[PDB]
């Protein structure tokens, strides 16, 4: 099996800049008929995979003259001429010159754009999910680059670990932030046992942390 | 044009058989073979073999002779690819490709193997909520299975300011939520709905944000 080697694994570019992945076959890679047959695909989170370049360089109609390709032997590089965010996805390399054919594992395109702070909002229960004998607290850290952020829960001024869900949305189309859901599960019987929810976040963007909370008597 | 279209997502238990249907308009089916691609969840593709429109001889990796059958009708424009005696490991998005050098992919077939049931979600309205310049409401969409919701606001009306997280699994079911930022010169008197679809099991609901 040839086994193909992409680099780097996730790269990181501003819009106008260029990019640069790396292929690299562990033998080469020209068929028994003397092609080569190395192919680039773009795959974005959305969708199925979309042909860029076929025969190492050969541009596929309606791929912009932005993205070129080029190599011999065991090396092989895709070139990103000038990044757009409509470029944001997963890049992989393959080749269909000896059986299997083999895929690289892909390399991940991130925009690099200027830090954001997270906005942050909290929310109670709401009064139907309390009456099935449950209570998520729900913390959503909306628009902040870099992709790092921490998030802690407090009950009654104490750290709670256990029963906190995270998701993080992948890259934003427009503006190239991410977002980010943390939610506190607990019963409605030790939810009903304390007054204070607090959502603390520490991100880059600030050396003290935004929190947001509410108490359950306050309004 | 040219497109390959397969059959929807799937529920399947341990053990079962799955029959998936790749079906190509746009040229003449029985110049191109057409490959088949798995990409278990995570990263990685992986190649499954491939099978000779014209004579249906087909072509298994390795790693996939025995349990995996591929067919077709021609009489039809469809390949089939069937999986035997299915393993939890066999969950992954399916996809039929045309060409021995590949060009064109179909959408992708996802198959979840599990013995987790078919289930509805429950849609709670996540308010502030009741009492600036700026609300942000939500919508959390509990205890579903299997992959994916539909959640639109609205009915598709609003699609500014809206994130939608990635579901995650909650012990043996999924959870999904999705948080809209309006004016808050616009709710509660605009009314804000958040419109859940679950096509596995068929559920609809419309939840009404009101002010707490
Ligand atoms: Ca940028
Ligand atoms: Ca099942």
């Known amino acids: 099996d040839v086994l193909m080697t992409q680099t780097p694994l996730s790269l990181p570019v501003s819009l106008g800049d260029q990019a640069s992945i790396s292929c690299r076959s562990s033998?080469?890679?020209?068929?028994?008929?003397?092609?080569?047959?190395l192919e680039w695909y773009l795959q974005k989170p959305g969708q199925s995979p979309k042909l860029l370049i076929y025969?190492?360089?050969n541009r596929f109609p309606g791929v912009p003259d932005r993205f070129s390709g080029s190599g011999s032997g065991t090396d092989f590089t895709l070139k990103i001429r000038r990044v757009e965010a409509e470029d944001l996805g997963v890049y992989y390399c393959?080749?269909?010159?000896?059986?299997?054919?083999?895929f690289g594992g892909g390399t991940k395109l991130e925009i690099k754009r200027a830090d954001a702070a997270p906005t942050v909002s909290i929310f109670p229960p709401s009064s139907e999910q309390l009456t099935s004998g449950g209570a998520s607290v729900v913390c959503f850290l909306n628009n902040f680059y870099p992709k790092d952020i921490n998030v802690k829960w407090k009950i009654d001024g104490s750290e709670r670990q256990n029963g906190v869900l995270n998701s993080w949305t992948d890259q934003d189309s427009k503006d190239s932030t991410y977002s980010m859901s943390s939610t506190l599960t607990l019963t409605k019987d030790e939810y009903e046992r304390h007054n204070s929810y607090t959502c603390e976040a520490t991100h880059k963007t600030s050396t003290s942390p935004i929190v947001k909370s509410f108490n359950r008597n306050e309004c | 044009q040219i497109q390959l279209v397969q059959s929807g997502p799937e529920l399947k238990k341990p053990g079962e058989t799955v029959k998936i249907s790749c079906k190509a308009s746009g040229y003449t089916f029985t110049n191109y073979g057409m490959n088949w691609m798995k990409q278990a969840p995570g990263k990685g593709f992986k190649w499954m073999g491939w099978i000779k429109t014209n004579t249906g001889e087909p072509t298994y990796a390795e790693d996939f002779k025995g349990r995996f059958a591929f067919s077709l009708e021609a009489s039809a424009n469809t390949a089939y690819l069937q999986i035997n005696n299915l393993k939890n490991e066999d969950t992954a998005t399916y996809f039929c490709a045309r060409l021995r050098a590949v060009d064109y992919w179909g959408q992708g077939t996802t198959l979840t193997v599990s013995s987790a049931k078919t289930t509805a979600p429950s849609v709670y309205p996540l308010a502030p909520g009741t009492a600036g310049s700026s609300v942000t409401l939500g919508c959390l969409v509990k205890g579903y299975f299997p992959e994916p919701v539909t959640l639109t606001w609205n009915s598709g009306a609003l699609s500014s300011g809206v994130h939608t997280f990635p579901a995650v699994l909650q012990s043996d079911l999924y959870t999904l939520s999705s948080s809209v930022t309006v004016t808050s010169s616009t709710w509660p008197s605009q009314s804000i709905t958040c419109n859940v679809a679950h096509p596995a099991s068929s559920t609809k609901v419309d939840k009404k944000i009101e002010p707490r």
């Open positions: 393959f080749q269909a010159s000896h059986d299997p054919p083999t």
């Open positions: 025969k190492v360089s």
């Open positions: 033998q080469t890679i020209v068929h028994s008929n003397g092609n080569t047959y």
